[PDB]
Ligand binder design. Sequence first.
Ligand SMILES: [Mg+2]
Ligand code: NA
Ligand code: NA
Ligand code: NA
Ligand code: NA
Ligand code: NA
Ligand code: NA
Lengths: 30, 30, 30
Amino acid sequence: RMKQLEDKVEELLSKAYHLENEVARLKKLV
Amino acid sequence: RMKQLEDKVEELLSKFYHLENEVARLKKLV
Amino acid sequence: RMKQLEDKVEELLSKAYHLENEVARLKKLV
Ligand SMILES: [Mg+2]
Ligand code: NA
Ligand code: NA
Ligand code: NA
Ligand code: NA
Ligand code: NA
Ligand code: NA
């Protein structure tokens, strides 16, 4: 079951990295 | 051990879904 | 393999609090 855990955390890392970008983007638009 | 992590990632999935909605609302107002 | 998953999940949860703060900050500014 460590395979499902690893694929979920890969998805969450990409989520986090994309949210990080949108936070940095949104910071410059205010 | 595997149960503890599962409940933590399922928490992470709900968290990330929630921040994504908030960002989506920040972008519309921005 | 297992300890790295647990460590990465800790690292995600901590960054989600960090992002929660950043998002709430922007939430004011728009
Ligand atoms: Mg999976
Ligand atoms: Na921008
Ligand atoms: Na932008
Ligand atoms: Na276990
Ligand atoms: Na069970
Ligand atoms: Na999901
Ligand atoms: Na390790």
